Subunit: 295 residues, 4 copies
């Protein structure tokens, strides 16, 4: 037998950082969960019990805190790239670092219509994420994403004209509820190294904002022919607005809300045009994915 | 042996309702999870296998949908009272109904600075809840609550002057992070029945809004001496603003964020005045409760 | 306003303890999650920012570890009583301690038909729990429980003869699946203090074992007329076997498995006597409770 | 823009099947959660709102139930292969089916030392899983796995001789707790189609059993030099016992249990040789992976 692939590191490292403006007294907080996995010439730790090649996972944890202390942690694309680069430069035998960062929302509170200097609220479990793969001699590959954005529209969704055969019971519809949890990922062109990532820093927050805005607007405004058709429209627009993105991927559950026939009870009318009360279904759910790139 | 207490019913009933304004085209959605448990002269179903006394839990589920179809589902205090009253009036041998409702957020989307007619976002997992106990001959008792409101302030929290003995290692502090998930419950004076609940309908949404606002403002503005002192200030204000509330209860976890000493690494300074990077602790957590009533 | 009730302490304190037999080399592990909440003359910490009355929650955490170091942690009824008693004896102004303990399963592995001296498996998320309330001048009240015991029987469950009215759609049945997650609690007679709890130590593990065995046997063997009837039979037997128990409470979800009519597809027969494939329902679920005591 | 990749289908489809032996009266239950995603000539549903190419996800759900009705559901490798093959044979324009199956434990109860004919217990949340990719013209690729197997050993684990530099604080150790949740995957040689999968049916359950047994025995018996070294030993043995496996992958969290220094309290000794009480850490955790194949 032989080691075909191996990676190891530290997962679920929670980090908080505060920035304090001495002049204005305004404080800004960042909270993330970080995972770092390393690859390189480490096979002997598996095959020969040779621990000399192992950078202890506890040391990786220390490194994350030290790096957060000495560098900005925003945008996460930059922080991930700094953190990944550290390991390949510091350790001769480590040749790849894989950094995943989940950013948690701490939104500044408005008290009496004014932004509070040091108080924050978690407005939703929506996350902004990055995956950064730093590979020695092959640059920095960055995938940025948003996830956990949960939306619903109560009309202006249709689904008709699908394949009908002996397995089909679903009725065609011209008016249904559409609800999903959005997972959207945009993959950046490969970067040669940290200097190049630094040169593009302003694009990271702007592109996240654009992806979010396009997702929300398209969902709200499209008279949707299917999840497939609506998600394609989203991806198309993102690619049009940021030339440094190579591909956009969406993964969307179709969270079903079923009509409830109440006609058995005193002829009560609750279907089609008369539908007011619905039963949200926890499972099963449709799952629709697509990756869109450039012609 | 004898049956000392018994209750049964249906839990986790998900319900969605849409309201459509024909004039404006604006649609408004409500989504809830409902639990109904009944008590009464049902001992024989346990002791003698006498099912004749059982209103099937499946029928309770049907009743929830039918009641939602025929009545407003907001404010939840009113809907819960209608639903509970139904069971005690309909069934001679049922003498109490216990209704719990969790309301999920579907917040209208703003697209290009304008409210969208039929598109919604789940902005946070904060819930608005009610517990309604309808007891034949004893009226309607309603406890309203908010939960899952997660907040953090990065300064203006202190904790010093506590008891110190041979079990104590905690250092006094004049500047710490304070973060909690707020669970706040206000208990209404007993209502004689549905007519009285209906007469107070406007107070329910207003009091929820007031409780939320007082919680957020007090948290943001108090230079907190402890969780205990800050939560008391919140409860005091709520009681002052709504005379129909008898008691307010808060239950607050103290979600700890620990300093990280980095001095072992090149004398790096990250504690006290120099603290910038912290380690959020998932467990254990302080838990602080109090119930405040009128003198 | 006035403080009507108040309690505070530390939740989610994870503890592991190992016992090492020097003679045999056999090691035995215990893992628990502990919560301790205190009450007493602590109102001024809420109303006057007087922290002098507060035993810091961090100190409570320390106390749990120290107490686990110096005392046996099994049976949990004894450990909880020692821990609770400590606070009321140590602190003049603390008059009640509320201790909740959840015990996690670490079951000794059998390797080649032999018990391994120091290796363990988590066989299921079933828990053994205790709630101990130590109240100065009123002794020690202990509620013991098991929870998270998930079972299913594929036949020998019926449900017919229930109330039928205009809200009822459920068909009577003489053969259905019955599945539940068992939560069972037995409440001990009040104990005067630690000496009395110590005197009954052997009864705690034996009664837990009896409760588990009676639950499993009755579920497996009863030709069940309803959840209500079967659970009553369980509680009856437990009370008969341990005179020091005052009441037994069961809380049982009815986790539904629905027939799937496949007759629309080539006349395929999958209902009633021909039912083979079913759809487990995640929600809603029946919830049935009862508390049984002595005549 | 262009569609680079696309797949869609139904997730979280819960299925239960019962088998009834008419002769012995013994019943056996199977419960699974199934996901099916399809690929093929479906781009136009995304780009042109052409639903004619879409096999509705609701129809996929129906197909899963119908297939379970007409075929054995065990071993899951066979069921997944039948289900996947169905879609590529039935639909001209569908060229790949991806089937994931999670099997839930329903273990027959022993009542009074005898196996009960129709009563079952969920002994642990350990799962047996399969991933089956059926690709037209490229056969059937099957990855089998077990997951959620949680184990702990209280001694006979060491970790010393790792890299030490200015980022390192971890002390070397010759005696520590080792605990993990095992995720192990074995990848089968490619199969040409259903006939070949059928020909190997007995190997599927046997190999699962072997993987489980080797994992447990090696964990219990290895005087572990690291997670890396122990997991390699496991994978090596599995590959040696089943020639039809091409690779074995393990992914193991290192769930840390920390010593608690209690010396500040009356010189209490709780570290090194005297360590009895430990603090399980919920996060962060080491994560160690490796894929082992044949020389
Ligand atoms: O078994 C281990 N492997 C590792 O890579 C490691 N790093 N810290 N502790 C550890 N333990
Ligand atoms: O056992 C049952 N008890 C009940 O109260 C009930 N209601 N519907 N189905 C049921 N099954
Ligand atoms: O606000 C606090 N209240 C408390 O009771 C406490 N105990 N430790 N830290 C604390 N902080
Ligand atoms: O938008 C949809 N896309 C689909 O593929 C589908 N299948 N059933 N319902 C559906 N809705
Ligand atoms: Na390198
Ligand atoms: Na009545
Ligand atoms: Na006392
Ligand atoms: Na095909
Ligand atoms: Xe969508
Ligand atoms: Xe607070
Ligand atoms: Xe039961
Ligand atoms: Xe391991």
């Amino acid at each position: 037998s032989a080691v075909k692939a191996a990676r190891y590191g530290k997962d679920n490292v929670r980090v908080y950082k505060v920035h304090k403006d001495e002049k204005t007294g305004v404080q800004t907080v960042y909270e993330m969960t970080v995972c770092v996995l390393l690859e390189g010439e480490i096979e002997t730790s598996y095959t020969k019990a040779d621990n000399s090649v192992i950078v202890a996972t506890d040391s990786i944890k220390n490194t994350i805190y030290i790096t957060a202390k000495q560098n900005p942690v925003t945008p996460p694309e930059l922080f991930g790239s700094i953190l990944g680069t550290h390991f390949i430069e510091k350790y001769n035998h480590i040749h790849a670092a894989h950094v995943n960062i989940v950013c948690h929302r701490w939104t500044r509170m408005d008290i009496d219509g004014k932004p509070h200097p040091h108080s924050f609220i978690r407005d939703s479990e929506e996350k902004r994420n990055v995956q950064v793969d730093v590979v020695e001699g092959k640059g920095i590959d960055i995938k940025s994403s948003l996830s956990g954005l949960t939306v619903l529209k109560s009309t202006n969704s249709q689904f008709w004209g699908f394949l009908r055969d002996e397995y089909t019971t679903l009725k065609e519809t011209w008016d249904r509820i559409l609800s999903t949890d959005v997972d959207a990922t945009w993959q950046w062109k490969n970067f040669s190294g940290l200097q190049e990532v630094r040169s593009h820093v302003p694009k990271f927050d702007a592109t996240w904002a654009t992806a979010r805005e396009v997702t929300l607007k398209t969902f709200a405004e499209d008279n949707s022919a299917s999840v497939q058709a609506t998600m394609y429209k989203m991806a198309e627009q993102i690619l049009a607005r940021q030339q440094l993105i190579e591909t956009v991927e969406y993964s969307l559950p179709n969270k079903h809300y079923f009509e409830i026939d109440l006609s058995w009870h005193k002829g009560l009318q609750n279907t089609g045009k008369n539908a007011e009360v619905f039963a949200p279904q926890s499972d099963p759910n449709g799952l629709i994915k697509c990756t869109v790139g450039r012609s």
